[PDB]
Design a protein around this nucleic acid. Structure first.
Ligand SMILES: [Mg+2]
Ligand SMILES: [Mg+2]
Ligand SMILES: [Mg+2]
Ligand SMILES: [Mg+2]
Ligand SMILES: [Mg+2]
Ligand SMILES: [Mg+2]
Ligand SMILES: [Mg+2]
Ligand SMILES: [Mg+2]
Ligand SMILES: [Mg+2]
Lengths: 95, 95, 137, 338, 52, 41
RNA sequence: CCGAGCCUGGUGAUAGCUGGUUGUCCAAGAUAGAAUCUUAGUUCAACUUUAAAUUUGCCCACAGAACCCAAAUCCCCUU
RNA sequence: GCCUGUUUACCAAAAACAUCACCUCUAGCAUCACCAGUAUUAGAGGCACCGCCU
RNA sequence: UUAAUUUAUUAAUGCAAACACCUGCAUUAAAAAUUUCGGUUGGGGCGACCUCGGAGCAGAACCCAACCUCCGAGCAGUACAUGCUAAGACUUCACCAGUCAAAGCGAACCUCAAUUGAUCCA
């Protein structure tokens, strides 16, 4: 990515990341499973159900996405009826 | 006339500022060439009797070529401006 | 424009000399009526697949004959093994029959002297080749 | 490695290589007939429609007859003094409509080379005969045998699992599962050469359709062409493998049982020398005597539909002609006397 | 071979699902569970999605 | 309007559905019977 | 010093390649693999370092881990 | 290799390039080359004098 | 160069615009321009291989290379609840992907080695 933009000197965001991943404010990154729209006719129902799910990212993948996105995408968003409002925070987490 | 359109949208410049263009803003696509448009007619007020068009003081839609090549240069017709229309209206009502 | 484009096809896209082009126009006037594209296909069929050079194509009125007849007879002989496209060196295992022996002669003489087969077989092959051309198109 | 060579052999398509070989050999073999055979091989192949006896055979036969195809097998039986395969008249190039599933859920007919049916007809499957198909696994002859009355079981073997799968699929499409369920049909992916040891003096009727140059397919299909340079070793060793397979089939067949050796090629080497070498090897190494049956009456009976190479010593050779593009097909019938 | 075909609910719902049938076989009519109607209903082949 | 059009179309289809299912099943059964009759010959 | 002149400028071109990378002292510290127009490189994993949290880590007694057709290993309370 | 000549200035002077001769192709024409020319001309190209056969 | 991408440039035509030239748009050539020329193996060739699965090597949890030994797959058949959901687990040594699945709703009262292909874009 661009660590210093030529016009502002700021760090830029890889919009390919924004187009693909959702960041929960807790720090978790959500994604769709690759191939969830491909050749479903040859996939079993269990496989299709697995593919149709929203999946969290690794620690290292989350760190990579955090580096690739700027602080604007890592803020609190109080949207009206966000389906992920509950998921935006962790509960009963021990270490 | 050749009418062209940018392939790449130019970022907004502001109110008093002038847009800043780049190499990609010099790429154009031809949206239309006016010379290929269907021909329209020119409105003229005849001043002298002319074959197959009119006699005098009658608004006529003539091919732009004829209007600009024969009638107007030779004085056989005048532009159908509001002033000419008024003048020929007085001419008509004075008869 | 029609005449000029016919001549231009014969010259630039067929590499016929000026004298050759005049002789072609003199000997095969039907070329002018024949549409472009088809004429180029006929010429290239003679040149590459049949290995006939410009002097021969002009001396024998090859462009006179129809592409259907040309393909019928030539492909019949080729599959029979009588004809053989000249190789890169321009050499053939057996000398090929002459264009006059292929096209000018009547159907019966072509089948007897050169192909050495039966009219029934030739008719079957003609129908098969027509079907193959239609399917190719 | 050496990159820059002095002269690289010209890159030939396998089709053109096969044409070169077939010219240089069959021209000598057949003299003046080679032109006609060459044009027939390079022309379209004439197909026959074998009506699936299991399906509405009468209805499909009526539909084909309306399509103006006649049952060459029926007319042959007419002057011979259970199979039905319709073919068009001599010289006709009409194509049979693609076969479709019938009311019974099985394909109405199989579009196969008519010449490929002659080996099965010559095999003469008596009612309730135990049958072997040593390597015949393209379909065709196998389906014809099953439609025949070999109710005492048929063992179809091949060394190619892909062709075994193809056989299984055609059997699913054509032969009813009720017929295929029992040991009536046993499909195997084993080597025919080992078959002499696996079973001996077991089958009353055997069909050995050895791998061959498959001249027409070699001339047409570029893929997996036997005449490509990489497969030179296989092409060279083909005669030995064919002899081994025919010997295995002869060992398997019961004493007094009948075998038919079939080949889709014109090669004298791959047909007549193969059968003769198999006879000699069987009579020497294993001391078993085999007598070649006379198929001349078969030739005369089926001459109206197929053109036969008259100058043949052992067996029969359907040669492809333009009037009847059904060949090539060599088939030799051999009864194991001892 | 087989062709992938789109069976469409005959219940008037826009529900559709893809099945496989032999190309040579007749067009397909088939009972299938319709989630919107919450009931098994007839589905009729509409169009060939692709060949396989 | 769209919701009610969808609902009434679904209602008509559902009203016709049992008869359609019965007819299709009867057609399948009669086709099988015709196949058995052909086998009988 | 021409398979495409020379000078200046873009230009601090680029180089997964070569070379170099300058005070003292102590401490921990070495290779499971996968993917890659990739095997002269890089991303992940593995290993390694640092800081922090709390709690079992290793060694390991029985018992236990397959039919077809050996050395050992895994799991493992005690210690 | 016809010949006289030409060539890799600074590793090759040659059988290589050119060469008269012969052959192929293109062009019906003027005011800046071709050309102040016009088919026995001009341009592009091959090959290599001449002579002999088929 | 019959490698890919172009025809910006010229030469032709065609259609427009004007009443042959000029301009715009097309088509065909000439001429060029930009860029590339994968990988692992094979010295006496005329190539082989690249992804997935089973077996031995690797005998007994797992893991194990090869320019090692063999064998195979790029489907087919059935069914149309082959629907929806969901604890907990496995995982080809990463990730991606791939597996199994209690319970529940709703219904009745898939198989076996592999049989495949991400994103973007249509
Ligand atoms: Mg502002
Ligand atoms: Mg540098
Ligand atoms: Mg230390
Ligand atoms: Mg000299
Ligand atoms: Mg000298
Ligand atoms: Mg020198
Ligand atoms: Mg000098
Ligand atoms: Mg010197
Ligand atoms: Mg894992």
């Amino acid at each position: 990515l661009t660590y210093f933009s030529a016009r502002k000197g700021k760090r830029k965001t890889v919009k390919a990341v924004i187009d693909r991943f959702l960041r929960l404010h807790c720090g978790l990154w959500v994604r769709r499973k690759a191939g969830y729209k491909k050749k479903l006719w040859k996939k079993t129902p269990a496989r299709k159900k697995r593919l149709r799910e929203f999946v969290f990212c690794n620690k290292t993948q989350s760190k990579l996405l955090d580096k690739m996105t700027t602080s604007f995408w890592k803020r609190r968003n109080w949207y009206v009826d966000d389906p992920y409002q509950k998921y935006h925070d962790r509960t009963n987490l021990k270490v | 006339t050749v009418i062209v359109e940018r392939w790449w949208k130019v970022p907004l410049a502001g109110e008093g500022r002038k847009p800043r263009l780049h190499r990609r803003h010099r790429v154009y696509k031809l949206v239309e060439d006016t010379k290929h448009r269907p021909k329209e007619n020119l409105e003229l007020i005849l001043t002298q009797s002319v074959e197959n068009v009119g006699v005098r003081g009658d608004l006529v839609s003539v091919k732009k070529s004829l209007g600009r090549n024969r009638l107007l240069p030779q004085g056989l017709a005048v532009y159908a401006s509001p002033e000419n229309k008024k003048l020929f209206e007085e001419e008509k009502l004075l008869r | 424009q029609d005449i000029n484009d016919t001549v231009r096809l014969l010259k630039e896209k067929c590499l016929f000399t000026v004298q050759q082009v005049t002789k072609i126009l003199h000997s095969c006037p039907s070329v002018l009526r024949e549409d472009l594209g088809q004429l180029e296909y006929k010429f290239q069929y003679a040149y590459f697949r049949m290995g006939i050079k410009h002097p021969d194509i002009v001396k024998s009125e090859y462009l006179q004959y129809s592409l259907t007849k040309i393909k019928q007879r030539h492909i019949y002989l080729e599959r029979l093994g009588r004809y053989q496209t000249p190789d890169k060196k321009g050499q053939t295992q057996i000398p090929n029959p002459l264009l006059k022996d292929i096209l000018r002669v009547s159907e019966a003489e072509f089948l007897a002297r050169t192909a050495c087969t039966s009219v029934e077989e030739f008719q079957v092959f003609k129908k098969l080749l027509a079907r193959e051309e239609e399917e190719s198109e | 490695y050496k990159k820059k060579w002095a002269a690289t052999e010209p890159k030939f398509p396998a089709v053109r290589l096969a044409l070169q070989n077939f010219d240089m050999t069959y021209s000598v073999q057949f003299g003046d007939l080679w032109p006609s055979i060459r044009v027939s091989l390079l022309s379209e192949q004439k197909y026959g429609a074998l009506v699936n006896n299991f399906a509405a055979w009468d209805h499909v036969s009526a539909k084909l007859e309306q399509l103006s195809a006649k049952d060459f097998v029926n007319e042959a039986i007419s002057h011979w003094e259970n199979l039905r395969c319709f073919t068009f008249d001599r010289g006709d190039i009409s194509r049979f409509p693609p076969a479709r599933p019938g009311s019974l859920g099985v394909m109405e007919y199989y579009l196969m080379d008519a010449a490929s049916l002659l080996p099965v007809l010559a095999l003469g499957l008596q009612p309730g005969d135990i049958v072997l198909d040593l390597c015949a696994a393209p379909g065709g002859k196998t389906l014809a045998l099953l439609q025949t009355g070999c109710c005492r079981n048929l063992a179809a073997n091949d060394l190619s699992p892909s062709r075994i799968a193809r056989l299984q699929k055609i059997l699913h499409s054509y032969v009813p599962e009720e017929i295929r369920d029992g040991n009536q049909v046993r499909v195997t992916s084993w080597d025919g050469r080992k078959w002499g040891e696996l079973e001996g003096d077991t089958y009353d009727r055997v069909l050995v359709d050895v791998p061959c140059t498959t001249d027409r397919h070699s001339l047409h299909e570029e893929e997996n062409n036997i005449f490509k340079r990489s497969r030179k070793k296989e092409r060279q060793i083909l005669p030995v493998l064919q002899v081994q397979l025919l010997a295995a089939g002869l060992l398997a067949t019961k004493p007094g049982g009948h075998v038919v050796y079939s080949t889709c090629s014109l090669s004298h080497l791959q047909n007549e020398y193969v059968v003769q070498g198999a006879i000699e090897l069987l009579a020497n190494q294993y001391s078993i005597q085999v007598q070649v049956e006379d198929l001349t009456h078969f030739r005369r009976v089926f001459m109206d539909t197929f053109c036969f190479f008259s100058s043949c010593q052992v067996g029969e050779l359907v040669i492809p002609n333009l009037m009847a593009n059904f060949g090539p097909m060599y088939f030799c019938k051999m009864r194991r006397l001892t | 071979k087989n062709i992938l075909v789109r069976m469409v609910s005959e219940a008037g719902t826009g529900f559709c699902f893809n099945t496989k049938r032999n190309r040579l076989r007749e067009k397909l009519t088939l009972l299938h569970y319709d989630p919107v109607v919450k009931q098994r209903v007839l589905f009729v082949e509409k169009k060939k999605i692709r060949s396989l | 309007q769209k919701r009610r059009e969808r609902e009434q179309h679904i209602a008509e289809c559902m009203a016709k559905m049992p008869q359609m299912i019965v007819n299709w099943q009867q057609q399948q059964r009669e086709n099988w019977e015709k196949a058995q009759a052909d086998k009988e010959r």
